[PDB]
Write a protein that binds this ligand. Structure first.
Ligand code: NDP
Ligand code: ZN
Lengths: 355, 123, 118, 86, 125, 485
């Protein structure tokens, strides 16, 4: 039979005064009782999260803006489990609707770039404040913000500045808020890491490929958010999900090139020129690197040692050099067989040309 | 006449344990020699040694079976699976049915003592 | 109407949609779920939806109490809900009701009542 | 083992192994209950079982030996040993 | 011993052999009827596992399940065949011996017999 | 009335709690719901009949149930987890430090034998011998003694009333305790020569009874005067004692007199016939006495500090102090929950494959019809887990180990459906009924009916509205229920 691998018990009780009795063995038909809300399930991390939540029958409310990106989530659970709402941070009633009946809330909002309708401030600060005020009004028992690694309130990067302001506002309205701080995530169809090193015609670094970091598999961060949504010990806490092994950019690129058996192209042209070329590419409608991210190329990962980690959740986070084979074998060209010699004499026995 | 496929063996029920010993050993040898093919044909995310480990486990499963007819049945079923795997009939899912372990740890609480099973109503 | 959710929040629903049917408020059977308990348990799937357009058929328990009693001379009344307008049976099986007792008596299939002229 | 607290006799009704214990029960039970005034003495029968005694001293520590002997006196001494070997 | 273990070639799980109980029995003669045809066959039905028998769905009110043997009921001609099949498949079984009506004489005359003393009860028919 | 149709139903063959007879039945479920109960055949117990309580109390298994654990924080209950309540129980044990016989264990009607075993082994493992029934005088050991099965059972089996010639009823209304055996007495009274007597409250019986007193004084009078001679000169006489006698302070004075008469009159006690009988009114008491579960006199006088009461809803608020910690186990909230500081759901008879022992001493095995609802669990699992949470453990983990334990307690608990004779009748009446009961003096308090209402007897039945409608009607004061003859 199947199992409720996520739950430690069957009768759980939220901090809002709801009783949640589990039903079943933990398969597609089961129900965990819980009702959550994930504000970015359409994206890279939230997709894996809703998959792990709805595999066990947890009701999942998924706010969307594009109707067509989401459809790949309805597969993740039985009927009635995954529920969709059209929402926008510029409409408040939509946010109250999404969070009303929820025991858990999960904020994954945030672009790696600015737009015409949303600057970094409006999406990482004001959006967090709107959600927090609604999480507070309705007194939702749990709130699980995700704010980027290296976040610091004042910093050369505006992204990390906002991400730090989003932290303090959430925690200054919702005191029981949990905050996670993942490091650069990697996996299949990642944004800016392996699909780029494997597809992009040429890389560039305003520094050298020297920015140091601890990357991590995204499935494990999704496992972490699962092991935090249900553990009530994690209120008014902070996490640093970074990973065992420290990797410079050039190290990752060399492993990528080795596994791919193709020579990745890197250039290493200076800062102001790349910063200008990025600025001019922000006028075309599709996402591209933005002036504030080449700024983060000079900002290596400072880890906060006062915050919890994977080992506080009984997790064993994975290593990049093992997983790169699984993640890059599709782009492996595999030109041909090695050393065809000592095969002429064997081929000579077969009929190659029929008449 | 409807001729046999590639790696087909005619079903033949041996009357002795001493011959089936040899036939089983040849099957094990073929599985091992063909494991790299089982890694290439199926897009596998682990080692050839881990495949050989699982094969050894599957053969240790029925190591202590002394009824001759049941052994003949087991050998025939194993040759069926070798024919299914080496010819590219199985797809990835039906093959990785044999490798649950390699997939990521399913959650946190995997009960092993009584009290946890009771809290999860599995006792 | 304002319905309290389990999670401590509220659920506002207008009065026209809390009635069990447009002709009756209360439930007509002990195991029937009242519309308030329905909403309170299922608002995740009612949230952005329009309640005007959801199916709200009339109840029969109230439309059959309106039907006048019928009368007969004798200890039997025969019922067969037959259309008399089109061919075939189109009704329910013949049922002979006893009507000697003082009150009205209803067919078990249809609720039409019969009395002994008094 | 601070005290005896319960005694359980098991035996057949009509089998061969149990007759000496049947005599012990018919003849010595009141003396056993007076020499151990604080203990539940329980006799429970069932055809086909192998005669045997259980004692419970304290905190559930239970002891046991069979009583397939050929005399009432072997029963007395064997019972008494199990009552002493706490 | 020497009863073959067909459980190894059955292709079925081992949880049936290690954790699951069956019961072998004859269907009791119903009291709502007087027929006895549904009897004379030795059914075999699995015993319930509590967590996964049935549970009510939230969506529409249907009853779910995870026990895959909640509807399987093998029928046998005799007790010995049932027990052999169970042992050959390695299932653990409890036998439920039937309870038969005890024969006693019935006469129409006993309704109309003489009471030399006070009438115990007055008969209707 | 209209709830279901037969093809939809899962027929399961199980046992009828609500009486000590152990009437076999056939439950009919529709998934999680139990629609109805109907009888099953067994000629040595119920012979095609069952009472109305057992057929109409099913409606109490789907209302006022316990689905989650509860804790008391004041005047309110608060829903809680299993982890939290069991840890709360452990902290209460460690804070309170009950010593020896301060830990009380109460097992009521409608309990298995596995549960009472697990509660007994756990209690003793904490150093306590205060195991006790929910009966009025359950605090002290029974007058008739648990030593031999013959002293507290319906020895002459329920198939033995057909062979009866003379009968005596002491403090029992069989129409309210085991109606099925009242029906059997009447079936025998009509077609045979049978002469009956009663010493108890005048009981509106389905047969002629020849009432002759309500006191111990009239009891000794009849047993030594006329009906004594009727019982001597009978071939298969019966002396039926109610369990309400066991629920009196002067029970020894009775059981002594009856034992003196039994040993004195061969016709009641021979090598072919035991005409002494104790009719229990609940299905737990015989299994309890078979596994011990009687208070020791040392614990009988201690004022308990913790009170684990199991299926008990007949308590009086005087048996349980205020300053004690209390832990109810049950499947229905009617009385014992209201006292409790902690409430732990159990399962009803339809949701546990329990063993239940009846008056004859016949062990019957139940079947599970459905899974227990919600956050409910089988009892013996709950007591193993709390045991582990406490500073002790039980040495068994699954069913087979619990069964081997039962055999280690008593081997007739795993001889299902087999009723056994017994060789220690003379000794049993000499050792238990006559000896240690000479010191009790008889009261003048006239006997009272044990059951003031056949309906609304236990928790399942009090939670059934059908028993409420049926106890409002079917009352003697109503005109409909009395014919003017
Ligand atoms: N992936 C990584 O390497 C790292 C991620 N993070 C943080 O973790 C989270 C992961 O997001 P990621 O996994 O990167 O994939 P995305 O960043 O693509 O997830 C973005 C989600 O946010 C939603 N969203 C963005 N802007 C708005 C808006 N203005 N209004 C409403 N919804 C909006 C998107 O909705 P739609 O898709 O419908 O437009 C999408 O679902 C982000 O908060 C990111 O800052 C931190 C460090 C590293
Ligand atoms: Zn009609």
């Amino acid at each position: 039979m199947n199992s409720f691998e996520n739950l430690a018990q069957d009768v759980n009780i939220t901090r809002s005064g709801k009783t949640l009795i589990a039903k079943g063995t933990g398969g597609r038909s089961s129900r965990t009782g819980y009702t959550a809300t994930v504000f970015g399930a359409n994206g890279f991390l939230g997709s894996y999260l809703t998959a792990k939540l709805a595999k066990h029958g947890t009701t999942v409310v998924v706010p969307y803006r594009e109707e067509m990106a989401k459809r790949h989530l309805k597969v993740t659970g039985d009927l009635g489990v995954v529920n969709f709402l059209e929402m926008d941070l510029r409409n408040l009633e939509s946010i109250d609707e999404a969070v009303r009946h929820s025991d858990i809330v999960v904020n994954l909002i945030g672009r790696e770039y600015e737009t015409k309708n949303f600057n970094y401030y409006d999406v990482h600060v004001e959006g967090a404040r709107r959600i927090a005020e609604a999480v507070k009004k309705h007194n939702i028992a749990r709130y699980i913000h995700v704010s980027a690694f290296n976040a610091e309130i004042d910093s050369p990067s505006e992204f990390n500045h906002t991400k730090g302001l989003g932290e303090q506002v959430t925690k200054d309205i919702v005191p029981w808020a949990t905050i996670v701080r993942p490091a650069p995530m990697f996996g299949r169809e990642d944004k800016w890491f392996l699909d780029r090193m494997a597809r992009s015609p040429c890389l560039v670094s305003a520094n050298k490929f020297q920015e140091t970091s601890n990357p991590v598999h995204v499935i494990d961060v999704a496992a972490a958010l699962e092991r935090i949504c249900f553990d009530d010990s994690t209120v008014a806490q902070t996490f640093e999900l970074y990973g065992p092994q420290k990797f410079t950019q050039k190290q990752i690129i060399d492993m990528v090139s080795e596994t791919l058996r193709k020579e990745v192209r890197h250039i290493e042209l200076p800062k102001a020129l790349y910063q200008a070329y990025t600025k001019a590419t922000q006028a075309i409608w599709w996402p591209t690197y933005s002036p504030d991210q080449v700024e983060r190329q000079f900002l290596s990962q400072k880890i906060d040692p006062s915050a919890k980690t994977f080992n506080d959740l009984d997790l064993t986070p994975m290593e990049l050099p093992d997983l790169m084979f699984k993640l890059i074998r599709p782009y492996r060209v595999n030109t041909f067989q090695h050393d065809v010699s000592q095969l002429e004499n064997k081929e000579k026995t077969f009929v190659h040309i029929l008449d | 006449a409807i001729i046999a496929t590639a790696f087909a063996e005619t079903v033949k029920f041996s009357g002795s344990k001493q011959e089936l010993q040899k036939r089983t050993l040849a099957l094990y040898r073929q599985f091992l020699r063909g494991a790299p093919t089982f890694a290439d044909l199926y897009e596998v995310q682990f080692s050839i040694p881990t495949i050989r480990t699982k094969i050894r486990q599957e053969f240790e499963r029925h190591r202590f079976v002394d009824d001759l007819s049941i052994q003949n049945v087991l050998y025939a079923k194993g040759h069926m699976e070798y024919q299914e795997c080496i010819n590219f009939w199985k797809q990835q899912a039906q093959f990785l049915k044999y490798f649950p372990e390699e997939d990521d740890i399913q959650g946190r609480h995997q009960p092993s003592n009584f009290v946890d099973k009771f809290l999860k109503n599995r006792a | 109407k304002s319905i309290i959710s389990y999670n401590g929040n509220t659920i506002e629903i207008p009065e026209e949609y809390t009635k069990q049917a447009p002709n009756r408020d209360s439930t007509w059977a002990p195991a029937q779920a009242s519309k308030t308990e329905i909403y309170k348990n299922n608002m995740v799937r009612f949230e952005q939806k329009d309640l005007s357009k959801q199916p709200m058929p009339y109840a029969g328990i109230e439309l059959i109490a309106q039907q006048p009693v019928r009368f007969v001379h004798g200890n039997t009344a025969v019922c067969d809900g037959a259309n008399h307008n089109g061919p075939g049976a189109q009704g329910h099986p013949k049922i002979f009701i006893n009507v000697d007792a003082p009150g009205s008596h209803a067919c078990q299939y249809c609720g039409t009542r019969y009395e002994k002229e008094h | 083992s601070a005290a005896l607290r319960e005694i359980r006799f098991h035996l057949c009704q009509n089998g061969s192994s149990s007759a000496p214990l049947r005599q012990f029960v018919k003849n010595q039970i009141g003396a056993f209950q007076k020499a151990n005034p604080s203990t539940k003495v329980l006799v429970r029968e069932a055809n086909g079982v192998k005669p045997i005694v259980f004692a419970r001293f304290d905190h559930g520590h239970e002891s046991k030996i069979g009583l397939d002997v050929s005399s009432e006196k072997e029963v007395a001494e064997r019972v008494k040993s199990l009552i002493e070997a706490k | 011993d020497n009863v073959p273990a067909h459980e190894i070639v059955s292709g079925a799980p081992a949880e049936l052999s290690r954790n699951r109980v069956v019961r072998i029995y004859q269907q009791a003669k119903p009291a709502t009827q007087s027929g006895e045809y549904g009897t004379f066959a030795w059914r075999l039905d699995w015993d319930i596992v509590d967590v996964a028998n049935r549970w009510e769905n939230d969506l529409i009110g249907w009853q779910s399940s995870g026990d895959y043997m909640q509807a399987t009921q093998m029928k046998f001609t005799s007790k010995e065949s049932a027990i052999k099949f169970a042992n050959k498949q390695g299932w653990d079984f409890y036998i439920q011996e039937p309870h038969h009506r005890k024969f006693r004489v019935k006469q129409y005359a006993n309704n109309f017999v003489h009471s030399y003393g006070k009438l115990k009860h007055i008969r209707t028919k | 009335a209209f709830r279901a149709r037969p093809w939809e139903l899962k027929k399961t063959e199980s046992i009828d709690v609500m009486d000590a007879v152990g009437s076999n039945i056939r439950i009919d479920s529709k998934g999680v719901e139990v629609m109805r109960v109907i009888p099953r055949v067994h000629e040595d117990v119920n012979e095609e009949w069952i009472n109305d309580k057992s057929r109409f109390a099913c409606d109490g298994l789907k209302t006022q149930r316990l689905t989650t654990p509860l804790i008391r924080v004041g005047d309110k209950f608060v829903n809680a987890t299993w982890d939290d309540a069991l840890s709360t129980i452990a902290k209460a044990y460690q804070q309170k430090a009950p010593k020896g016989d301060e830990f009380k264990a109460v097992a009521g009607a409608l309990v298995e034998v596995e549960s009472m075993v697990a509660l007994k082994d756990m209690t003793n493992a904490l150093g306590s011998e205060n195991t006790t029934t929910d009966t009025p005088n359950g605090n002290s050991a029974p007058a008739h003694g648990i030593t031999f099965r013959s002293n507290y059972l319906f020895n002459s089996s329920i198939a033995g009333i057909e062979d009866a010639d003379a009968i005596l009823l002491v403090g029992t209304n069989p129409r309210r305790e085991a109606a099925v055996m009242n029906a059997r007495i009447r079936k025998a009274w009509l077609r045979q020569e049978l002469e009956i007597a009663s010493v108890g409250p005048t009981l509106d019986a389905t047969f002629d009874v020849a009432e002759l007193g309500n006191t111990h004084a009239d009891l000794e009078k009849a047993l030594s005067g006329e009906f004594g001679e009727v019982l001597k000169n009978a071939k298969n006489p019966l002396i039926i004692v109610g369990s309400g006698i066991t629920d009196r302070e002067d029970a020894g004075a009775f059981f002594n007199t009856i034992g003196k008469f039994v040993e004195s009159t061969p016709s009641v006690l021979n090598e072919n016939w035991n005409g002494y009988n104790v009719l229990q009114r609940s299905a737990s008491r015989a299994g309890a006495y078979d596994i011990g579960f009687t208070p020791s006199d040392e614990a009988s006088k201690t004022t308990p500090k913790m009170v684990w009461l199991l299926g008990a809803d007949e308590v009086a608020a005087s048996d349980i102090p205020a300053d004690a910690f209390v832990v109810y186990q049950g499947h229905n909230g009617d009385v014992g929950a209201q006292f409790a500081d902690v409430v732990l759901p159990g399962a009803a008879y339809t949701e546990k494959a329990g063993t239940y022992v009846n008056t004859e001493g016949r062990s019957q095995i139940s079947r599970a019809a459905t899974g227990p609802p919600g956050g409910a669990r089988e009892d013996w699992k709950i007591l193993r887990a709390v045991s582990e949470y406490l500073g002790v453990a039980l040495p068994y983990e699954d069913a087979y180990e619990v069964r081997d334990r039962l055999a280690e307690i008593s081997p007739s608990l795993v001889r299902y459906d087999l009723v056994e004779p017994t060789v220690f009748g003379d000794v049993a009446v000499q050792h238990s009924l006559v000896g240690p009961n000479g010191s009790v003096t008889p009261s003048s308090a006239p006997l009272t009916e044990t059951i003031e209402n056949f309906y609304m007897t236990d928790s399942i039945s009090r939670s059934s509205p059908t028993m409420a409608k049926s106890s409002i009607a079917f009352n003697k004061d109503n005109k409909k229920n009395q014919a003017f003859a």
